[PDB]
Amino acid sequence: EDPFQQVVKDTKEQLNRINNYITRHNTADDQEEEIQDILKDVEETIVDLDRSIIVMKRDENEDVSGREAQVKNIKQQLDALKLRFDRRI
């Protein structure tokens, strides 16, 4: 919807897509470089979401607690995924 919500949605979708892939190829791979590149891009995307929250928080007419909870959730999704990725044997 707003640019922030769109990126949130794209990021969860992007993480979910790799997660589905890992389930189907859980052995240690064609997409190995690709997955590393996308995960690093996701890291830097979350930094952008956090900066965006920082600036919005300056506006006393904004409550960023909903956005903060969405970013925390994405970070949890990313952390769970990174471990799955790392542990393919």
Binding site: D2, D10, Y21, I35
Partner: peptide, 22 residues
């Protein structure tokens, strides 16, 4: 198959643009 989500990079740039409107 590509794992990449379409419009992800476009959407990030729109975020950063918004970031400089604020």
């Amino acid at each position: 198959k590509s794992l990449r989500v379409s419009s992800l990079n476009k959407d990030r740039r729109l975020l950063l643009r918004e970031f400089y409107n604020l």
